[PDB]
Amino acid sequence: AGGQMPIHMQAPKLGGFHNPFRTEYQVVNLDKVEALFPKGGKITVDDLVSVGAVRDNELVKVLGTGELTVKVDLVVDAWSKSAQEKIEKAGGSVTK
Amino acid sequence: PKMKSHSGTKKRFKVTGSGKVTARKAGKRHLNEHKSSRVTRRLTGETVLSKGEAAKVKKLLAGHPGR
RNA sequence: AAACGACUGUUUACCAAAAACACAGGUCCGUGCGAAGUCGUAAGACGAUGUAUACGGACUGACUCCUGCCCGGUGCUGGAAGGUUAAGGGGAACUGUGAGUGUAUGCGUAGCGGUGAACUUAAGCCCCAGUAAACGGCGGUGGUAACUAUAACCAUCCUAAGGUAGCGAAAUUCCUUGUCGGGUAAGUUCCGACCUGCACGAAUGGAGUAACGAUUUCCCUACUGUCUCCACCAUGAACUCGGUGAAAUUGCAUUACGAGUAAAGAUGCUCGUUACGCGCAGCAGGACGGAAAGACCCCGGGACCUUUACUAUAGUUUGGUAUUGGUGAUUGGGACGGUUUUCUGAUUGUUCUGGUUAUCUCACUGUGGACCGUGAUCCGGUUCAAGGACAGUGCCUGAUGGGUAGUUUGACUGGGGCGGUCGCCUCCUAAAGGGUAACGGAGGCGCCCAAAGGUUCCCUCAGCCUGGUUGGUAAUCAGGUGGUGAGUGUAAGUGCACAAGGGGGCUUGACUGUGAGACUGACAGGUCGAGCAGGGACGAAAGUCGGGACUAGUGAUCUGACGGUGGCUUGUGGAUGCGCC
RNA sequence: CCCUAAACCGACACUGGUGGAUAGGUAGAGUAUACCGAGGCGAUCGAGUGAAUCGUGGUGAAGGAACUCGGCAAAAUGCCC
RNA sequence: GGGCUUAAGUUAUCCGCCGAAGCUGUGGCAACCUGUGUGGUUGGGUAGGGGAGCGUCGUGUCAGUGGUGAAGCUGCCGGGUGACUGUGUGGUGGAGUUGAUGCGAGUGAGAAUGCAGGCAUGAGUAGCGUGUGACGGGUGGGAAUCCCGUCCGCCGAUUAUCCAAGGGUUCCAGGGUCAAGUUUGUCUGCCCUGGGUGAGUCGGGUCCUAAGGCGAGGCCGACAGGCGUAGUCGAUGGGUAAC
RNA sequence: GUCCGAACCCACUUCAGUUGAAAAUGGAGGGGAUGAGUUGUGGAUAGGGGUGAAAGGCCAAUCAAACACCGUGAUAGCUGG
RNA sequence: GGGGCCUUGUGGUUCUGCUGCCGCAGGAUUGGCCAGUGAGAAAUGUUGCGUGAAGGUGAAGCGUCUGGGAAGGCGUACCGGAGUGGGUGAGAGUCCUGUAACUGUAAGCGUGGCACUGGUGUGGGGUUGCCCCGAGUAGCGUGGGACUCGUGGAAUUUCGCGUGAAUCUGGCGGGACCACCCGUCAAGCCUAAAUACUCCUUGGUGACCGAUAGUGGAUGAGUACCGUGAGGGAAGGGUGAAAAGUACCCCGGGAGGGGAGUGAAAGAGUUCCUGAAACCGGUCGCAUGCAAGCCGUCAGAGCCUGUGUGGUGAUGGCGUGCCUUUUGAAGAAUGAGCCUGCGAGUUAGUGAUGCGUGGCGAGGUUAACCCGUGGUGGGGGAGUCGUAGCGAAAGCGAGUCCGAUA
RNA sequence: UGAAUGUAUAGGGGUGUGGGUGGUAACGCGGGGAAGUGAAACAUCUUAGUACCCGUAGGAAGAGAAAACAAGUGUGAUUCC
Ligand SMILES: [Mg+2]
Ligand SMILES: [Mg+2]
Ligand SMILES: [Mg+2]
Ligand SMILES: [Mg+2]
Ligand SMILES: [Mg+2]
Ligand SMILES: [Mg+2]
Ligand SMILES: [Mg+2]
Ligand SMILES: [Mg+2]
Ligand SMILES: [Mg+2]
Ligand SMILES: [Mg+2]
Ligand SMILES: [Mg+2]
Ligand SMILES: [Mg+2]
Ligand SMILES: [Mg+2]
Ligand SMILES: [Mg+2]
Ligand SMILES: [Mg+2]
Ligand SMILES: [Mg+2]
Ligand SMILES: [Mg+2]
Ligand SMILES: [Mg+2]
Ligand SMILES: [Mg+2]
Ligand SMILES: [Mg+2]
Ligand SMILES: [Mg+2]
Ligand SMILES: [Mg+2]
Ligand SMILES: [Mg+2]
Ligand SMILES: [Mg+2]
Ligand SMILES: [Mg+2]
Ligand SMILES: [Mg+2]
Ligand SMILES: [Mg+2]
Ligand SMILES: [Mg+2]
Ligand SMILES: [Mg+2]
Ligand SMILES: [Mg+2]
Ligand SMILES: [Mg+2]
Ligand SMILES: [Mg+2]
Ligand SMILES: [Mg+2]
Ligand SMILES: [Mg+2]
Ligand SMILES: [Mg+2]
Ligand SMILES: [Mg+2]
Ligand SMILES: [Mg+2]
Ligand SMILES: [Mg+2]
Ligand SMILES: [Mg+2]
Ligand SMILES: [Mg+2]
Ligand SMILES: [Mg+2]
Ligand SMILES: [Mg+2]
Ligand SMILES: [Mg+2]
Ligand SMILES: [Mg+2]
Ligand SMILES: [Mg+2]
Ligand SMILES: [Mg+2]
Ligand SMILES: [Mg+2]
Ligand SMILES: [Mg+2]
Ligand SMILES: [Mg+2]
Ligand SMILES: [Mg+2]
Ligand SMILES: [Mg+2]
Ligand SMILES: [Mg+2]
Ligand SMILES: [Mg+2]
Ligand SMILES: [Mg+2]
Ligand SMILES: [Mg+2]
Ligand SMILES: [Mg+2]
Ligand SMILES: [Mg+2]
Ligand SMILES: [Mg+2]
Ligand SMILES: [Mg+2]
Ligand SMILES: [Mg+2]
Ligand SMILES: [Mg+2]
Ligand SMILES: [Mg+2]
Ligand SMILES: [Mg+2]
Ligand SMILES: [Mg+2]
Ligand SMILES: [Mg+2]
Ligand SMILES: [Mg+2]
Ligand SMILES: [Mg+2]
Ligand SMILES: [Mg+2]
Ligand SMILES: [Mg+2]
Ligand SMILES: [Mg+2]
Ligand SMILES: [Mg+2]
Ligand SMILES: [Mg+2]
Ligand SMILES: [Mg+2]
Ligand SMILES: [Mg+2]
Ligand SMILES: [Mg+2]
Ligand SMILES: [Mg+2]
Ligand SMILES: [Mg+2]
Ligand SMILES: [Mg+2]
Ligand SMILES: [Mg+2]
Ligand SMILES: [Mg+2]
Ligand SMILES: [Mg+2]
Ligand SMILES: [Mg+2]
Ligand SMILES: [Mg+2]
Ligand SMILES: [Mg+2]
Ligand SMILES: [Mg+2]
Ligand SMILES: [Mg+2]
Ligand SMILES: [Mg+2]
Ligand SMILES: [Mg+2]
Ligand SMILES: [Mg+2]
Ligand SMILES: [Mg+2]
Ligand SMILES: [Mg+2]
Ligand SMILES: [Mg+2]
Ligand SMILES: [Mg+2]
Ligand SMILES: [Mg+2]
Ligand SMILES: [Mg+2]
Ligand SMILES: [Mg+2]
Ligand SMILES: [Mg+2]
Ligand SMILES: [Mg+2]
Ligand SMILES: [Mg+2]
Ligand SMILES: [Mg+2]
Ligand SMILES: [Mg+2]
Ligand SMILES: [Mg+2]
Ligand SMILES: [Mg+2]
Ligand SMILES: [Mg+2]
Ligand SMILES: [Mg+2]
Ligand SMILES: [Mg+2]
Ligand SMILES: [Mg+2]
Ligand SMILES: [Mg+2]
Ligand SMILES: [Mg+2]
Ligand SMILES: [Mg+2]
Ligand SMILES: [Mg+2]
Ligand SMILES: [Mg+2]
Ligand SMILES: [Mg+2]
Ligand SMILES: [Mg+2]
Ligand SMILES: [Mg+2]
Ligand SMILES: [Mg+2]
Ligand SMILES: [Mg+2]
Ligand SMILES: [Mg+2]
Ligand SMILES: [Mg+2]
Ligand SMILES: [Mg+2]
Ligand SMILES: [Mg+2]
Ligand SMILES: [Mg+2]
Ligand SMILES: [Mg+2]
Ligand SMILES: [Mg+2]
Ligand SMILES: [Mg+2]
Ligand SMILES: [Mg+2]
Ligand SMILES: [Mg+2]
Ligand SMILES: [Mg+2]
Ligand SMILES: [Mg+2]
Ligand SMILES: [Mg+2]
Ligand SMILES: [Mg+2]
Ligand SMILES: [Mg+2]
Ligand SMILES: [Mg+2]
Ligand SMILES: [Mg+2]
Ligand SMILES: [Mg+2]
Ligand SMILES: [Mg+2]
Ligand SMILES: [Mg+2]
């Protein structure tokens, strides 16, 4: 910076730490599940979404943006409270 | 040869989802008794970087997403 | 005749031959012999096949007379009463885990760990002496003699002591061509003095000194073309002819002068003047001529040198420990039972261990003698002698260490240096928004205040005039007048009398979570802020309060620390570490 | 074969450097200097020409350091008894 | 500047003119915008940004082309807005190479006191390296400079003679005159061919050691290596038989 | 470590040379010339080292740290292209 | 785990010992599940294939035209498991050399592998009484080093110096340390392949160079030359198809030239292909000896030529080089004597970040590697970017964080 | 055969029994180990365990058959990409 204390040295370091064992979820939303499984999609497994798009060999938490008029039974790793509520109200369930 | 990122830049700047470059506010590490709660609150959050500084940071980062 | 060096010598190959170096002579310091010293990692070696009348280092430098005072500083030598002080030894204490105990919290045995270490412990340093032919130092004010100038002399301040003998306008004297005398017709030089020594001085020697010197200086005489003032002669070039035949340099070219103009000195531009074309011999005024990326100056980099710059390090030195063992005392820290009485007070034996100290010797010493390998001054073995658990060496450890190494040693600047300045606040310059420079003109700040903060209520000043005890211009009281000229914690400016100035009551908002919206900087950043919640202060309420009438009183990041919290913890549980505020 | 060099060291067939030996006559102290001997050379561009000027020598009236920073240079002196 | 007051000087006023790459006229080119049948605006330019191209070499493909003459060089006559260029037309030359479209670059030079080569300028100029030569004859294409002779001059503690070191055939004889020789040269220390150096006694070795070197074992040292004993070398010296 | 003075060693002054005869000399004088003299032959000391009667002098014609090669195409906020 | 103690099992034996006239072992031409020249606790011959070093066979064209010459033009035929190249007097599938294809290999120290000879040779269930299981080793301390880790919370590993274990109810590791759990068994050794490289030998290749380039070196090249030495270090290629390299004569001492010959060409004559520029000249046209000139440009007479276009150009106006670097240079600031040649924005990343363009598209794309000995083609999805963000993180998630489920 | 000297050993005397010596362009293993440079100065750090040096191979070398990883199920010597 010409001799002036540069930006990467006048700014304080963002501290914190990294979780060495953190695992990310491949998230899918209810709009995607409705679009890819419209015809009364009975049971959706991780293999089915990974066939469409969930990037297989990962955990598949399902999230809850969207309406989900159809009835689905999603056996997946983890889900949000809103997604579970919407799925149950639509007539389906979640497992695992 | 892969081009390495800047380590201080790695440790100091975040890149948001829309692409903004943000740093931690500077001036609150010590000497905080004379500083009022208003001054400390002004120095307590995050700052979006200006255009030239943000471009410099994205250059120093080697495609590193920030911290 | 003077200065310097005593002399003969030596030296900067290639700008310095000297006054520089050396020298014979002198003194100091070190060295007892495997010497000290030096080259080398070491063995070795030189010193020296020498032995204190010797060797090495330092300074001075024949000879003559002398070499004065100071040991405060620093160095060196010696010493050790106390202080400080490493590694090591060694406590006490704390602490993690943990069988289990605990209704659970928690605690915690054994074992395995971790932390720093009361006491003990060296040299060095502080400390006390000596040492100057060690590195060094050798002063001030006031005044006084019968012309005046000075001070032998007196008082004093201070120091470790205050410059002795001798010399002095000097290889030293700035002023300075000091003054006086000599030498000249005339002498800033000379030489003899004077003493007013800017800023001599006694082995970095003082003052002298016969002889010596391609040293420096002044004078006399002889002699001369050095000169007045040059002339002439012969020669090697130059010149002409025949032969041979370079060079530096070169943007060009059919390359004048004057006065101007222009990057401020023009062959080349302007206005004029002059000038037929081409040669030969010459001279040097110009072509800012050629030659050499100025060597002076500044800026950036480097190199080498210095030191009480920094950081290291060879060497030197201190102790601990290994090598490293045997045998006694004399003093403390224990376990141990059992004189005392676990004990304020004392102990012997019975086991473990620090220190102080004394002897022994197939550790070791690379050593003196003899012998053997061998008919070998190396080397090795045996042995005697002499030391001896020392020394030496390895590792650890403190001190010392320009001997050596790597580097640092800011910028601004009417060149650089010296001096000044460097961040923040107020005013002017600043041209009526904001901004605006100079080594421009003025000043302030690096705080302070538990009230000088918050709130609520009340009050009006300075100055002037008059009356009144101390009391006066001015303490305190009374009446009139007085609007801001008083005051404001603190510079200045903007404000404030509706007071933001003076006072009374209660208080801690000098809050916690926030911050719509803005101002101001390239940015980091700086600044103002409505409304809301919690929990408070004052007020009857309205409301106000996130320090101070406002604007200075401050320091990013890294790194580390303390309190809280408990998000993470590399198999699990702890611990430990990290994270967040 | 060269060898105080045209053959070596100097880039040269370079007025430089290079150790040793022999080394006669007359004058002279002399291995100085002059002229010769033994012996060897005439030197590796010449021929001319009274230009200035530069170098190298020579002479010089009267004066005699007036020169110059300075007697630089030269002159004077010089040998034997 | 000439010259000017008899203004061509100052001043007021009036009437004309000159004067730029400005403006207008006319003829081309180009950028942008705009309704999209008018056209309007615009086009000096360093640093610099953007866009589009010329030429060189290699190369895939296609079409070819070349001794009835490729490349390269060199003229003339033409062409484009530029880098440039013709499928015009010669000359020289003697074996390659053209156009279209792509692909890849060691792709463009006027300068770096740039590097290499060649050639100018100074210039037929400076110099030709201490000096004494003259003449007669010869040789020869050619003679100041070669050979012979006679005069004269020069060195002579060296311009002589002989060695060492060093050089290496330069020595001698013949043939030579491209180059070298600071000129010429018929000459030469140069060129080519051939020849030439003979030791019991001279100088070295075969003998000896100095300084110094190396060094069996050995000692010292992380390695590499250092030192050194016994020895072995090593003349500048000792010894050794001819004039 | 006497005197004058050749050879020999040196280098004080001056003139010339300065693209030289010569990358340090020549002419004319000058100093030492039995001594701490000079010289031949061989040898020893080597680069943060040598050696130095001491000038930072000399160590193969530029030495306040030789030369060669390598790190290396060192680096240059500077000049040039 | 092994030893020991036993419940047992050796390949069929001629018959010798010791232990209990049980049993165990040396013993032997004859099996053999095995196992071999290997690292394997080891190392000794005769028979079985195809090759590199050399070789062998190896297809198929003539006629005319022009030319010095035919491989070229024209005409008309062949071979091809061979049309990759290179030579030949110009441009060859059929002229040569070769090429494709087959083939031989005596020999190798041959080499690889197979067969035989010859050489060497088993365990399973039970038991823990007892016995062994790598010592100055591991750890620990200290001074250093390697590990992402630069002394730290310092695991692991290693060197010097001290100190110093346990041994299976044991040791070590899982990032200080301890406990449990998991894994493992140090202080002994040997081991192919996958990996690295090329002084060399054989064959081949190139949008690599083409004599200032490519090696320093196309030639007496590490030569000449320079340096004491270590070391440094060049430049010089081309006649022609074939020497047919110019017999002979003339001028000249020669050199050189002129005639002539050879050759397609000699102005291809050995200084030899082509033969540029600078530079040096001969000839012709114009101008030029009264003139002040960045040397040009515009206007322009005259002369020559007229190949009616071109050369020169008296005379008039205007006009201070090029580059670099500067506020400003004609500058008396820098650099350049001239010409020819050479001499500076490149290349590599499954780098970063844009843009253009093409493919695919909620998906895109492979890396190493494997197959194609036939290449540029195919596979390989390991990974990677996109698909959701916010938070120090646990985590939550179209939200999340500061916050009080504000 | 066995010194001083006793055991013996050192040493001495016979035999050649076997191996060695030196070279080698790159690659390997073990050890010693820069600086320029970057950090816009510089010392930690970088350069870089590079350059260079030493010892020593082989046709390759080194490593190699768990006192290993992993994390609760598992993999199973080394090397290389
Ligand atoms: Mg700063
Ligand atoms: Mg904090
Ligand atoms: Mg606070
Ligand atoms: Mg005097
Ligand atoms: Mg005197
Ligand atoms: Mg003297
Ligand atoms: Mg003398
Ligand atoms: Mg000198
Ligand atoms: Mg001198
Ligand atoms: Mg003495
Ligand atoms: Mg000693
Ligand atoms: Mg001795
Ligand atoms: Mg002394
Ligand atoms: Mg003295
Ligand atoms: Mg004296
Ligand atoms: Mg003490
Ligand atoms: Mg005393
Ligand atoms: Mg004076
Ligand atoms: Mg005076
Ligand atoms: Mg007087
Ligand atoms: Mg004294
Ligand atoms: Mg003095
Ligand atoms: Mg003194
Ligand atoms: Mg005297
Ligand atoms: Mg002439
Ligand atoms: Mg002017
Ligand atoms: Mg003028
Ligand atoms: Mg002009
Ligand atoms: Mg003239
Ligand atoms: Mg002249
Ligand atoms: Mg000049
Ligand atoms: Mg300069
Ligand atoms: Mg420096
Ligand atoms: Mg000690
Ligand atoms: Mg004894
Ligand atoms: Mg230093
Ligand atoms: Mg440095
Ligand atoms: Mg400055
Ligand atoms: Mg100034
Ligand atoms: Mg204003
Ligand atoms: Mg204004
Ligand atoms: Mg300004
Ligand atoms: Mg506060
Ligand atoms: Mg806001
Ligand atoms: Mg402020
Ligand atoms: Mg409230
Ligand atoms: Mg107040
Ligand atoms: Mg920092
Ligand atoms: Mg783990
Ligand atoms: Mg807070
Ligand atoms: Mg000579
Ligand atoms: Mg002679
Ligand atoms: Mg010579
Ligand atoms: Mg001599
Ligand atoms: Mg005589
Ligand atoms: Mg004589
Ligand atoms: Mg004679
Ligand atoms: Mg002679
Ligand atoms: Mg002559
Ligand atoms: Mg002559
Ligand atoms: Mg000559
Ligand atoms: Mg006369
Ligand atoms: Mg006279
Ligand atoms: Mg007279
Ligand atoms: Mg007289
Ligand atoms: Mg006078
Ligand atoms: Mg006089
Ligand atoms: Mg005068
Ligand atoms: Mg004189
Ligand atoms: Mg005289
Ligand atoms: Mg116009
Ligand atoms: Mg334009
Ligand atoms: Mg531009
Ligand atoms: Mg044709
Ligand atoms: Mg071509
Ligand atoms: Mg094309
Ligand atoms: Mg190029
Ligand atoms: Mg060019
Ligand atoms: Mg040039
Ligand atoms: Mg010429
Ligand atoms: Mg002439
Ligand atoms: Mg001339
Ligand atoms: Mg002349
Ligand atoms: Mg002449
Ligand atoms: Mg004659
Ligand atoms: Mg004579
Ligand atoms: Mg000979
Ligand atoms: Mg011959
Ligand atoms: Mg010869
Ligand atoms: Mg001869
Ligand atoms: Mg002859
Ligand atoms: Mg000649
Ligand atoms: Mg001849
Ligand atoms: Mg000897
Ligand atoms: Mg030996
Ligand atoms: Mg001998
Ligand atoms: Mg001899
Ligand atoms: Mg004498
Ligand atoms: Mg004398
Ligand atoms: Mg001398
Ligand atoms: Mg020698
Ligand atoms: Mg000095
Ligand atoms: Mg020298
Ligand atoms: Mg130097
Ligand atoms: Mg140095
Ligand atoms: Mg480097
Ligand atoms: Mg055939
Ligand atoms: Mg035909
Ligand atoms: Mg590290
Ligand atoms: Mg450890
Ligand atoms: Mg361990
Ligand atoms: Mg763990
Ligand atoms: Mg084991
Ligand atoms: Mg192994
Ligand atoms: Mg290969
Ligand atoms: Mg060439
Ligand atoms: Mg070449
Ligand atoms: Mg060519
Ligand atoms: Mg040589
Ligand atoms: Mg013929
Ligand atoms: Mg021709
Ligand atoms: Mg030709
Ligand atoms: Mg005329
Ligand atoms: Mg004029
Ligand atoms: Mg500019
Ligand atoms: Mg200027
Ligand atoms: Mg110029
Ligand atoms: Mg000029
Ligand atoms: Mg410049
Ligand atoms: Mg120039
Ligand atoms: Mg995957
Ligand atoms: Mg280092
Ligand atoms: Mg360094
Ligand atoms: Mg740096
Ligand atoms: Mg730098
Ligand atoms: Mg081998
Ligand atoms: Mg191996």
Side-chain angles (χ1 to χ4, degrees):
Chain A
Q4 152 165 302
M5 200 66 54
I7 49 158
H8 58 87
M9 265 158 92
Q10 246 174 345
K13 279 204 276 179
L14 317 170
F17 64 96
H18 284 105
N19 185 15
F21 316 121
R22 171 192 170 82
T23 192
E24 294 245 354
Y25 288 91
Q26 288 288 315
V27 289
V28 73
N29 295 292
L30 285 181
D31 276 334
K32 203 130 194 103
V33 175
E34 223 184 339
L36 309 172
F37 303 93
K39 185 42 71 73
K42 193 86 174 184
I43 190 192
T44 319
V45 302
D46 281 1
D47 291 341
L48 302 206
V49 278
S50 151
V51 152
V54 88
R55 197 196 262 193
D56 57 351
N57 295 118
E58 315 285 335
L59 302 183
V60 190
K61 180 167 198 158
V62 46
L63 300 177
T65 169
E67 294 301 326
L68 193 81
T69 72
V70 311
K71 155 187 169 172
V72 297
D73 310 301
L74 279 146
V75 38
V76 293
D77 323 302
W79 47 88
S80 63
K81 286 163 234 146
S82 155
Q84 200 219 11
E85 198 268 355
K86 291 182 182 179
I87 287 171
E88 279 171 337
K89 190 184 190 293
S93 70
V94 277
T95 321
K96 263 213 319 210
Chain B
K2 304 140 104 202
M3 179 218 53
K4 321 207 184 183
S5 47
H6 198 251
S7 303
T9 316
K10 282 194 288 192
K11 282 143 200 184
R12 270 158 178 104
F13 306 100
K14 286 199 303 212
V15 186
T16 82
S18 81
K20 296 181 198 180
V21 177
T22 35
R24 179 187 245 254
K25 285 284 298 195
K28 212 194 50 160
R29 286 282 209 243
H30 70 151
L31 299 159
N32 288 330
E33 181 263 319
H34 80 100
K35 310 201 190 116
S36 179
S37 265
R38 298 178 287 101
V39 178
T40 279
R41 192 158 41 252
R42 283 184 214 138
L43 300 167
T44 208
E46 208 96 6
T47 149
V48 178
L49 254 62
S50 153
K51 262 198 298 192
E53 275 60 29
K56 244 174 160 211
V57 164
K58 282 202 237 80
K59 248 145 181 205
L60 285 168
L61 294 160
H64 201 282
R67 199 240 159 260

